[PDB]
A paper describes a structure:
All 21 Dprs and nine DIPs are predicted to contain two and three immunoglobulin (IG) domains, respectively. Our previous work identified the first IG domains, termed [name], as the domains mediating the Dpr–[name] interaction by the formation of a pseudo-symmetric [name]-[name] heterocomplex using the GFCC’C’ face of the immunoglobulin fold. Therefore, Dprs and DIPs are strong candidates for a synapse specification or targeting function.
We crystallized and solved the structures of Dpr1 [name] with [name]-η [name], and [name] [name] with [name]-γ [name] +2. When the interface residues at the Dpr subunits are superimposed, the three [name] subunits are slightly displaced, with [name]-γ (dark gray in Figure 3) more distant from the other DIPs (~1.2 Å at the interface and up to 3 Å at the back face of the IG domain, Figure 3a; see Figure 3—figure supplement 1b for details of the displacement at the interface). Hence, different Dpr–[name] complexes can be established not only through shape complementarity between Dpr and [name] surfaces, but also by small but significant movements of the Dpr and [name] monomers with respect to each other, a mechanism not commonly recognized for related interaction pairs. This movement of Gln78 in [name]-γ is then accommodated by a glycine in [name] position 157, which is otherwise a bulkier and hydrophobic Leu and Ile in Dpr1 and 6. However, in [name]–[name]-γ, for which our structure unexpectedly shows no hydrogen bond, the His-to-Ala mutation abolished binding by more than five-fold. The A165Y mutation is expected to create of a hydrogen bond absent in the [name]–[name]-γ complex but present in Dpr6–[name]-α and the engineered [name] A165Y F167Y K207V–[name]-α complex.
Numbering used by the authors:
A (entry chain B): 37 to 188, 194 to 240
B (entry chain A): 123 to 217
The structure:
Amino acid sequence: PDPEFIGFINNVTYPAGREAILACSVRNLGKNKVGWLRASDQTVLALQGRVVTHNARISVMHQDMHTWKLKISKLRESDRGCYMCQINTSPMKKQVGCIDVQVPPDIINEESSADLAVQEGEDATLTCKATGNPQPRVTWRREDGEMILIRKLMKVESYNGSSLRLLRLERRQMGAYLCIASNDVPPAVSKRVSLSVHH
Amino acid sequence: ATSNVTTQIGTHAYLPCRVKQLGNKSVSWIRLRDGHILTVDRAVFIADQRFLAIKQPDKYWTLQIKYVQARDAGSYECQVSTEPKVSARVQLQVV
Ligand SMILES: *[C@@H]1O[C@H](CO[C@@H]2O[C@@H](C)[C@@H](O)[C@@H](O)[C@@H]2O)[C@@H](O[C@@H]2O[C@H](CO)[C@@H](O[C@@H]3O[C@H](CO)[C@@H](O)[C@H](O)[C@@H]3O)[C@H](O)[C@H]2NC(C)=O)[C@H](O)[C@H]1NC(C)=O
């Protein structure tokens, strides 16, 4: 009779480079048909057992008459999002499966501080811009282990933020600063930025 | 072409696909309000048989909606199955 879904599409979380499979199960499909739509950019992916998109990483598979599979190989971060399995009943029936594509942190040297020099008592902002999914946290600490000095100024052994803002610099504050970028997706990364303070 | 098509209730609407078909890629129509897949090439997915995809020799496609009703008004999108897609919208106005 009227086709219906068996369970719900299971949602997946993979690092980039892995393969994602979304299974859409239907009972009594009859003469109806199953289509796939990528929801983020409303792109038709497949219709029945045929792939529509010329994206060569995406395919569809059908063995058990009830289960319709969407496969995305070598997951890219832009594949993240939800995927609609449509049954052409009237009114339409649909389920959605979602892909979380995790990306490990990466610090961009172009948009991040290189070794810099400042005159004593001047200001100096160190900055590490980071990419990743989830968006990576950025932590600033001194390689030698001394506490950084920022407004309460006060002594902290770590600062969370992309831009470490140092002002009224004194001679003690010269040396190597680490910015660590992490998002619980391994591996965390760090950039080593060296600050020199002239008299 | 045009992104605004006006059609009297009860007459056939012809929605231009304002994007050119490239090579052997497919041409598909979707309804934007619900994401409902309508046509893929000449295959009609939606059960409503007033919907028809017309393939022209010069690679410019058309979505025909026979006997337009008020409920048909809204935005439609033509898309060519490159990755990323090439797409163009059409507002159908019913009068
Ligand atoms: C995979 O994820 C989908 C989607 O989940 C939701 O949307 C995402 C964008 C995220 O924001 C998620 O955090 C968010 O929860 C799950 O689908 C949802 O499943 C529930 C079932 O618990 C659906 O609710 C029901 O709908 C049925 C009919 O379909 C009714 O009979 C029930 O009474 C109940 O209302 C809900 O509609 C559905 N949402 C969508 C958009 O599809 C899905 O369950 C999940 N997969 C698994 C295996 O958990």
